[PDB]
Amino acid sequence: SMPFVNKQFNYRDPVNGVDIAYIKIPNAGQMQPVKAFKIHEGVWVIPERDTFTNPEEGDLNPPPEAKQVPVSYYDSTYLSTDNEKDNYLKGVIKLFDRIYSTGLGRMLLSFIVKGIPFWGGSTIDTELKVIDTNCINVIEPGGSYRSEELNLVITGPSADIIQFECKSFGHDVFNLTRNGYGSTQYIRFSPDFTFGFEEGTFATDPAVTLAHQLIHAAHRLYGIAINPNRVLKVKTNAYYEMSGLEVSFEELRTFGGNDTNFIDSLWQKKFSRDAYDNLQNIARILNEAKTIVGTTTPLQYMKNIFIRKYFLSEDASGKISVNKAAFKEFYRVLTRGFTELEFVNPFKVINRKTFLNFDKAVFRINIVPDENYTINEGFNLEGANSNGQNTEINSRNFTRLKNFT
Amino acid sequence: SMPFVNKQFNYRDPVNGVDIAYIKIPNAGQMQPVKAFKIHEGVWVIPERDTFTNPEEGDLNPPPEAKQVPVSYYDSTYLSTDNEKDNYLKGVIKLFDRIYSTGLGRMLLSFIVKGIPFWGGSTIDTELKVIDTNCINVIEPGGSYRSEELNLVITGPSADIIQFECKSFGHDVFNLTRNGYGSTQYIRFSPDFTFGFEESLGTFATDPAVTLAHQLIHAAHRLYGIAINPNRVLKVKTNAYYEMSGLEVSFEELRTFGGNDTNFIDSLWQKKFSRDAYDNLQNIARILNEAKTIVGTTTPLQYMKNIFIRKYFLSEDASGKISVNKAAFKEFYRVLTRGFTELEFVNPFKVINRKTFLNFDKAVFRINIVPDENYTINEGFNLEGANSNGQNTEINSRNFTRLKNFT
Ligand SMILES: [Zn+2]
Ligand SMILES: [Zn+2]
């Protein structure tokens, strides 16, 4: 019942340079400042359509029908008015509160908040330094600017309104999402739409959809995401030779349950070994660090951030190391405790059972009013059932916009 | 506690032409007669190696070792002596009694006994006639034979002892297993071996009653003509240089196993399979309504119509017109496809079991279930208590002799 977001935010609240500010994303060259809200330590929400993180995706034009995929939805006017942005902000906040009301969501969000990208940006071996792509540029009242570290940004979707994804900026030398370091994560997401599926009789709770992307973000903030070149190719058609479906190992892991079982035990051992090896490397770097630059935080306090992040051990002499048992639990939580299917019962929802059950339609929803959707029950306000997710019974809460069939 | 098999059978019991006789399968061209036991109405057991249903698999020769797959087991001497065939016979009967001791198995076996293959074999549209794939020839004193209908035959395995499967004749040219008609089913099976597996990630052994129930579920689907087309398959592949082998599993197998595997079948496929089965019952209803004669039997036409009215849970109105009731079909189809799964038997049998096909068996073990000190009708291997220590191949090591690992 403790909320994740400890104060009320309205889109029209005046900027203050602290938790309501105009910001710019350093890797986005051509952007004008956008109003953003720091809803929790390290977590910002930008209630705008994402035209700025990627130069190529800088417009909201729907492609020609022949280039569209069936599972997509376009509306260039969505999220253009202040009333819409206020509703978007409140809906995203409500979902974080819903996630945080479960034991598992509390653990997921604590990992995310603790998951400071590693300070591995110095060329000098004994010196800790931030990596500049894990910051935003904050505009302050008075015309002054500052750089500020953060872990997670939620933005509105790009052109395709239902293409939810978790992305981050790259490094010239490191694969930050896979070398244990982590990097600031940017999630495209909308609380104003959800998908329908059949046992489109039932609507997905948008809290599950956000939790899914937050699991990708946690994997990527802890630098243990599976290489996107590890992929499973699926066919259910005896006739199409080439045509089929492709799903990454990272997606099989993140979804969980029986889908993860498509990943061989030998791959799991390898990923575990690799993540353990990368923690050992980070410990060596922390042990060899003697100076720190770009902050007034003392060196030991900065080391402690990562001792806590990676559940590292420290002995009497200050030597940092990886405890095998602590790593085992750390890795289990991140890869097996945090899955989409593990959230189904804590949320008390009905949900898709596998990636092979494709969404059938997209619906408009409005979760901000408590008579429609609550923190503790989502759509299922009336009782301990999934009638609230039934798009026929509870039809007033789900307006069908497009079928994918 | 009532058994499925209401009398005792010994392999050496003298033939009697009724429930112990030498038989020939008409669709198996070159087979010599084999001793068979009618353990229940419509159900026969042939306690010998299957060298006769398929002439090409008429030998027990182990293929060249270089040609063998890891998941296989060969022993040309298994089931060669009368003592072995007797032990096989009694073990299969014991598993039927174990299945029959559960409410769900009793329902499954009731569907199997009632599931007479449809009499749709006539060249004339208005005439009911048997289809020849659904009979055996029973040898009588004097060497002459008579034709007798049946639903199910259990035989010993062919060359590969652990290749358990449910098969039927005319599968190449007929669609009897998918058009609602059904056909007599032949199961290769052994109660003398079972598989070991590890709890989800060969410490635990599968209860052979679960394995037989699995094959009987295939048989029920095929006796009711609702089997999913075997070209409906789930195929997964990775890069060709990856050690981990791609996989192939039919939709029919995903359905039969149950649980989370069935969820890999998209709802749109499920709706189609249901619609197809409903349409095929409408065809059967139309054929029964238009039937005016019956041939090859003194059973009156109306009695045979009633047999299939009951089989398919068809409705009759005041005028005698047969039709499919939507609610009756929905329940009919649910029972056959959702009620009868391998995983639905796990708790009735009180066993530990694999949860998915993606958890592959690790080994094959020799077992001996006939002695009650090893395995009972009501408890299987788990004699000790309400646990699965009886299935632990380490604790209960005396009941599981490891023969081959598949890794
Ligand atoms: Zn995903
Ligand atoms: Zn099967």
Residue numbers in the entry:
A (entry chain A): 2 to 200, 213 to 418
B (entry chain B): 2 to 202, 213 to 418
Question: Paper's wording?
Answer:
Botulinum neurotoxins (BoNTs), secreted by neurotoxigenic Gram-positive strains of Clostridia, are the most toxic bacterial proteins known. Each BoNT is synthesized as a large precursor that is cleaved into two polypeptide chains that remain connected through an interchain disulfide bond: a heavy chain (HC, ∼100 kDa) and a light chain (LC, ∼50 kDa). The LC domain is a zinc-dependent protease that cleaves components of the soluble N-ethylmaleimide-sensitive-factor attachment receptor (SNARE) family of proteins, a process that blocks acetylcholine release at the neuromuscular junction and thereby causes flaccid paralysis of muscles. BoNT/A and E cleave synaptosomal-associated protein 25 (SNAP-25) and BoNTs B, D, F, and G cut vesicle-associated membrane protein (VAMP).
Catalytically inactive recombinant LC/A3 spanning residues Pro2–Lys417 and containing the double mutation Glu224Gln/Phe336Tyr was produced with an N-terminal cleavable 6xHis tag by bacterial expression (for details, see experimental procedures). Crystals suitable for the determination of the high-resolution structure of LC/A3 grew within 1–2 weeks, diffracted to 2.0 Å resolution and belong to the space group P212121, with two molecules per asymmetric unit. The LC/A3 structure represents the typical globular BoNT-LC domain fold with a conserved groove that extends from the catalytic site around the enzyme. The electron density is well defined for all residues, with the exception of loop 200 (amino acid residues Ser201-Ala212 and Glu203-Ala203 of chain A and B, respectively), which is likely to be disordered. BoNT/A3 is the subtype with the least conserved LC among subtypes and shares 81.9% sequence identity with LC/A1. The overall structural organization of the LPH region, however, is conserved between LC/A1 and LC/A3. Our structure also confirms the observation of Pellett et al. that the LPH region in LC/A3 contains a cluster of basic amino acids that is absent in LC/A1 (20). In our structure loop 250 has a different conformation and points away from the active site. This different orientation of loop 250 may explain the inability of LC/A3 to undergo autocleavage. However, the observation that their catalytic pockets are virtually identical and other substrate-binding residues are largely conserved suggests that LC/A3 may accommodate SNAP-25 in a similar way as LC/A1.
